[PDB]
């Protein structure tokens, strides 16, 4: 049934990681062809009956903001670019163009007339006018999220099936630095059969040319089979621009650029212009134009040739729009004509281009290899590796999880009912997925757009969380208040959402404080949402007005709770240290909220005069020599002071860690007769080269290994308590915190690089663990790929995204660290994991950003750090290049990535109120999970149609044995349901017609989608 996939390891023609073992990675003049070689080619290979067919492909890349935000340039450059795109194309039959970035498209189709709609709609139905991918952008393949990749996917998507009525089969992704097996991975659920991908390191680039395996069929690390196979077709030469697109001389095809001959303020940097075409000029223009495309055609296996046509944003002009078009009609007319070149050419799009080469494949003339492996970490040139991006404003990284997390569970929320038109749902969510998707682009997300850009795309994920709080807030009221009761006013805020870890403390004061008393109000209720398909307990804490508060669930159940002081980190600028004050007016309850799968759960907080049976207080103590008082109001255990001094704790029946002196995790002790495996946290800093290539927002260009940072004499907090304990040291640049609540513990650090000019800070593990040269990150949240240190290769090749999680391990020892915001990470020794905080640059890099990064913001990072024991588990074999999560470490992710949600009721009572609200969900087994679920109808809809993505991640086997868990059928989620069909990803196709209207759990690894349709 289920392919294994742990104990086959594939066999692939190519397997990254084993090609980068083989690789010298040697950076030699190729000539023109400057990281090549002199290609040759004998002028017999075709001939009258074995042409060589070459598609010129004309194309436009339009930034959905870089150097301009999204709307300056949709004014300035995108809507002239697509206006000019109709006219053109209209009056020339022949003329082809392709297009990718379907938030720009989406903006100027719903702004034109109704008679350019149609000529538009008929451009496209022609053939004339293709798209390709048709995402909402062309997103960054790195610190992206898988479900963020198909959210922006399926919001392009859905929009072209409405107004295009068209969905692309082919993907084009000619910008991404660098390129992920996630993409393949969606795109062949999402009914795609091609792709194209060009950012590869150079030496991957000579090495897979020479070999001709620049296509393949791109399958997962894991994939046996090859069911998961997708066509891929990685472009050759360092640019997709016109003088790296033809050819291998970029001096000869720059003079194929007709753009650049003057009078729209371009040139050739190889000193050769262009020259109009002409009857005296053609054969010689030719002869040149024909040597490069056959040389190119040498690097692939086929007689059909890829030549695209473009470069950013071109084609804005009508007098641009002429200019490349007649010229090229010119040099078409004559080499066609001229027999001795056995040449067709023409102007094509993507699609044409390979449907072609897969007719040339059935025709017998080509098979193709098979590959697996990811394209990280690129480099375009000499030791210019781009891991810096994988860090650059991690505040925005930080918060693309957030966001994430947000449209989740407001789409889920709200999915349970139909809602009238007045409610402003559907307005609100397209909204919020529509920033958010924007955000994915390779710009956004990645940290390397200027300063006006980002706060422009800061303002509109803003704007989204807003919308799916309104969203979350109106479905809460609707789902826990009796049905007869129920009077919603769709402005109304019946509650505010309560989030502990963003902004997060330090970063803002966000948070409302529960404003209990005698004489004014002695109870609030709460409401807990777990997005999760599995019963789920979780801390959750609130600021309350007093420390005498009791928590009761709504079958007034006494729940036991734990209140702490409000503490809050201080740069004194006349002590100059920086310590911790503490709130006398607000407090922190904490309690463990249990809630059903994707339910609800109320609670209530009372005050009382004096302390409450089931509520108990913690413990404080401050380590610093100089200490002075430290008073908090009401809370009725004193603080204690202390001189530095190592200290150990331990909550529950979980781990024992003990801390240095400097407030630092030193230790960790699984079990109570089991070691003290050392585990030691550290701060250092990296610089900057004062000879050379600078760091800048894309290249990490580092002055050699990481100095410690100096760290003083700092100021170490300890709060101790039944429920939770924790250390908190202010370190200088960060405050480091680490949580404890009875298992892996959870790590905060609050990052302000403040004015430190050239300066990267990272955060590096050492342990005993004796990995050698191996260790393990994850792409996109989907999969852990293993990697291996290359010493062959400069420090900053080794980093890599670390966009949720990394490990290493021996035979017997595991170290996971999760994280709640993709950064960039390696394991420089064996024994280390380090992951980078912030950077602040103050050179540009070369890369046309114009700009350094100086506008770095204080940001809460989140962790869970995982040591286990491994010699039990049932691992992939030496050869086998995926890695596989266990149960806790799998877990400690969800609780980073989608936390419970906490709700606060606004008003002084809630009438009609419910105690639960999913209690009769199926309780899933742990590796399953609904990554999405979407109502797909508005309410005038007599049949109501609900989306479900399913997911199952693959866990390792330890020995825990499994306890009995319900099978989950999403299609019975939802009364009356009268059909559930299996579709692509988007939702866009259906593919199966399902008996019973039973929705089958997937396979491990495997993401379906599932769509019920409700008689109702
Ligand atoms: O590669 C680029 C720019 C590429 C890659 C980085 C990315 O930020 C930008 C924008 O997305 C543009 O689309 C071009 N991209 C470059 C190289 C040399 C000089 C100037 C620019
Ligand atoms: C859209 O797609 C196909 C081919 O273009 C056509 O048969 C159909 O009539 C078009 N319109 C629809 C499905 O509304
Ligand atoms: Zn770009």
């Known amino acids: 049934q289920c392919q294994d996939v742990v104990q086959d390891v594939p066999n692939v023609d190519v397997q990254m990681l084993e090609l980068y073992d083989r690789m010298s990675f040697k950076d030699i003049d190729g000539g023109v062809w400057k990281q090549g070689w002199n290609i040759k080619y004998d002028p017999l290979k075709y001939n009258a009956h074995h042409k060589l067919k070459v598609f010129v492909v004309p194309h436009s890349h339009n930034d959905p903001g870089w150097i301009q935000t999204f709307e300056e340039y949709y004014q300035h450059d995108t809507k002239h670019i697509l206006s000019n795109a109709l006219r053109h194309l209209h009056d020339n039959p022949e003329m082809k163009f392709i297009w990718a970035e379907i938030s720009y498209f989406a903006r100027f189709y719903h702004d034109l007339g109704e008679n350019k ?243 040339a494949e059935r025709a017998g003339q080509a098979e193709f290899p098979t590959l697996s492996g990811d394209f990280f970490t690129y480099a375009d040139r000499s030791d210019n590796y781009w891991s ?65 850009v980002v706060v422009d795309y800061e303002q509109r994920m803003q704007e989204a969380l807003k919308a799916c709080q309104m969203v979350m807030q109106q479905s809460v009221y609707r789902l826990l208040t009796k049905p007869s009761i129920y009077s919603p006013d769709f402005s109304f805020s019946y509650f505010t959402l309560d989030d502990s870890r963003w902004p997060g403390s330090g970063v803002e004061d966000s ?40 928590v009761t669930d709504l079958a007034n159940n006494p729940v036991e709770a734990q209140v702490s002081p409000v503490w809050s980190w201080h740069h004194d600028t006349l002590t100059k240290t920086i310590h911790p004050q503490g709130s006398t007016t607000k407090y922190r309850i904490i309690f463990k909220a249990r809630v059903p799968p994707m339910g609800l759960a109320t609670y209530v907080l009372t005050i009382s005069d004096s302390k409450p049976e089931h509520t108990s207080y913690a413990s404080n103590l401050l380590l610093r020599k100089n200490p002075t008082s430290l008073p908090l109001g009401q809370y009725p255990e004193d603080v204690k002071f202390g001189d530095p001094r190592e200290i150990s704790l331990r909550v529950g029946n979980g781990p024992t860690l003990a801390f240095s002196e400097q407030g630092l995790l030193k230790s960790i002790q699984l079990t109570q007769d089991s070691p003290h495996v050392p585990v030691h946290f550290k701060f250092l800093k990296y610089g900057v080269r004062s000879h050379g290539d600078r760091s800048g927002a894309y290249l990490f260009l580092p002055n050699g290994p990481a100095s410690p940072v100096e760290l003083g004499q700092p100021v170490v907090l300890v709060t101790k308590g039944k429920l939770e304990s924790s250390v908190s040291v202010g370190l200088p640049s960060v405050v480091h915190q680490t949580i404890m609540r009875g298992g892996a513990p959870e790590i905060r650090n609050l990052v302000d690089i403040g004015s430190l000019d050239n300066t ?123 890695g596989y999560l266990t149960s806790a470490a799998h877990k400690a992710s969800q609780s980073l990535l989608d936390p419970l949600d906490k709700f606060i009721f606004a008003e002084n009572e809630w009438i009609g109120a419910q105690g639960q609200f999913g209690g009769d969900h199926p309780s899933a087994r742990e590796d399953l999970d609904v990554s999405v679920m979407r109502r797909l109808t508005k309410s005038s809809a007599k049949t109501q149609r609900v989306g479900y993505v399913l997911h199952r991640t693959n866990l390792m086997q330890c020995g825990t044995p499994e306890e009995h868990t319900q099978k989950l059928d999403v299609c019975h989620l939802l009364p009356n349901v009268a059909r559930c069909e299996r579709t692509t990803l988007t939702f866009l196709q259906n593919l199966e017609h399902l008996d019973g209207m039973v929705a089958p759990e997937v396979c491990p690894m495997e993401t379906a989608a599932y769509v019920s349709s409700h008689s109702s």
């Open 388 to 452: 810096g991006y994988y860090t650059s404003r991690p505040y925005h990284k930080r918060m693309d999880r957030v966001l994430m997390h947000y449209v989740r569970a407001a789409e889920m929320l709200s999915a349970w009912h139909s809602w009238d038109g007045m409610a402003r749902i559907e307005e609100r969510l397209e909204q919020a997925r529509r920033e958010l998707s924007l955000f994915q682009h390779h710009d956004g997300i990645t940290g390397t757009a200027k300063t006006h």
């Open 117 to 359: 709609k149609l000529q538009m709609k008929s451009i496209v139905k022609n053939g004339q006018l293709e798209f390709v991918t048709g995402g909402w952008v062309m997103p960054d393949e790195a610190n992206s999220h898988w479900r963020n990749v198909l959210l922006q996917l399926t919001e392009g998507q859905t929009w072209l099936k409405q107004f295009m009525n068209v969905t692309p089969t082919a993907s084009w992704a000619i910008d991404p630095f660098g390129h992920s097996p996630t993409m393949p991975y969606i795109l062949q659920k999402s009914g795609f059969k091609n792709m194209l991908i060009q950012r590869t390191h150079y030496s991957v680039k000579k090495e897979l040319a020479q070999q001709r395996q620049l296509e393949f069929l791109w399958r997962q690390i894991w994939d046996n089979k090859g069911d998961t196979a997708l066509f891929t077709h990685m472009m050759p030469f360092y640019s997709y621009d016109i003088p790296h697109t033809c050819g291998p001389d970029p001096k000869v095809c720059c003079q194929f650029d007709f753009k650049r001959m003057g009078s729209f303020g371009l040139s050739c940097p190889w000193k050769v212009p262009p020259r109009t075409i002409s009857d005296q000029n053609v054969a010689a223009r030719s002869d040149l134009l024909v040597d490069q495309w056959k040389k190119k055609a040498e690097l692939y296996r086929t007689n059909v040739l890829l030549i695209p046509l473009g470069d950013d944003f071109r084609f804005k002009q009508n007098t641009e729009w002429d200019v490349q078009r007649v010229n090229y009609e010119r040099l078409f007319e004559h080499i066609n004509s001229q027999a001795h070149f056995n040449v067709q050419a023409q102007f094509g799009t993507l699609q044409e281009y390979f449907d072609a080469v897969h007719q």
């Open 511 to 550: 948070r409302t404080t529960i404003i209990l008393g005698e004489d004014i109000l002695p109870s609030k209720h709460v409401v807990m949402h777990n997005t999760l398909p599995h019963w789920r307990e979780q801390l959750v804490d609130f600021y309350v007005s007093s420390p005498f508060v009791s």
């Open 760 to 882: 990267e800070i990272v955060m590096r593990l050492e342990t005993h663990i004796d990995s050698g040269d191996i260790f393990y990150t994850d792409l996109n949240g989907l999969q852990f790929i293993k990697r291996r240190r290359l010493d062959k290769l400069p420090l900053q090749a080794n980093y890599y995204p670390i966009p949720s999680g990394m490990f290493i391990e021996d035979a017997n020892t595991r170290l996971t660290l999760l994280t709640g915001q993709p950064l960039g990470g390696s394991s420089l020794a064996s024994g280390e994991l380090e992951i980078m905080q912030d950077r602040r640059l103050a050179s540009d890099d070369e890369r046309g950003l114009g700009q350094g990064v100086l506008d770095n913001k204080p940001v809460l990072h989140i962790y869970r750090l995982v040591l286990e024991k491994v010699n039990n588990c049932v691992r992939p074999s030496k050869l086998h290049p995926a």
